[PDB]
Structure 1
């Protein structure tokens, strides 16, 4: 049946093995890397909606001290549920499979009263992105473990900062 493949998985894995941090801000901040996928299996004449969703990886607060993460409490009562309806929705399966679905215009905010329909997160908690394919009973969900991350207000692990700077084209004024 329907199956989904994480585009640029290798790059994601270079991040998943340091502790992926994502910056959140009040205006909303993009994800790097970008979440893109190839989809296969959809009935090409059927119309679908593709939502993205971000959900708690665990129920802990965290702290970065002494070049290490460590649990320092229970995850606080986060946060006004919100979805990201992919802007090509709704669309024939054919349109979706044609080439990569990109979730690059999705933005993360720390603002709990946000007026932009951006996804709201809580600083210093781990999160897990989910894609939902819904028809326009049945909507299926795929998780890629390596896309899990920790929301931060500024980078902690300086390794990550440099990992973003070498690989994110908008950050090129910071390279060598």
Structure 2
């Protein structure tokens, strides 16, 4: 647990964070943008670990976007326990995980409470916090939370500034 985790593309995340990050969620499931990726150090090279993500409510509010601003508009909806996204390389050695960027870019977000594909179910107009968890594969694990990756789940982009950012930052 003397492990360090570093958010990749932090500057891009910050730009989105300043505006107020939104992530589109759909029936088919949508990848996050920015992608969530991390560098990890301090793992035992030979020990096996499972790396995984979840995405948990950031608060108890429900939100609306109006007058180019977000604001609380109600009580957050109750939900089922969040699904986990287990990194596909799991389980793997500390040396494997440390050798290059651990990317969670294939993680998908859906708004379909009946989703059959294992995608992470969110509710529109709620705020969420992505978390990374590191488990010795072998009762104990550690969790890393970057506040700048927090976001509001949306059904289509609300703040037109976000749309510009996404447009300006994806080659194709």
Gaps of 5+ in 1: 170-176
After TM superposition, the score normalised by the length of structure 1 is: 0.94
Distance verdict in 2 for CA 1:88–1:165, change over 3 Å: same
Q: Distance between the aligned counterparts of 1:82 and 1:51, measured in 2? A: 11
Q: Distance between the aligned counterparts of 1:117 and 1:59, measured in 2? A: 24
| 1:136-163 superposed Cα distances (whole Å, 9 cap, x missing partner) | 1320000000000000000000000000
Gaps of 5+ in 2: none
After TM superposition, the score normalised by the length of structure 2 is: 0.96
Q: Distance between the aligned counterparts of 2:79 and 2:168, measured in 1? A: 32
Contact 1:2 1:41 in 2 (8 A): yes
Contact 1:79 1:121 in 2 (8 A): no
Q: Distance between the aligned counterparts of 1:22 and 1:111, measured in 2? A: 15
| 1:89-108 superposed Cα distances (whole Å, 9 cap, x missing partner) | 00001000001000000000
Q: What's the Cα RMSD here?
A: 0.8
Q: Distance between the aligned counterparts of 2:170 and 2:59, measured in 1? A: 28
Where does 1:125-144 land on structure 2 (aligned, <5 Å)? 125-136=126-137, 137-144=139-146
Q: Which moved more, 1:29-38 or 1:76-85?
A: 76-85
| Alpha-carbon offset, residue 66 of structure 1 | 1.2
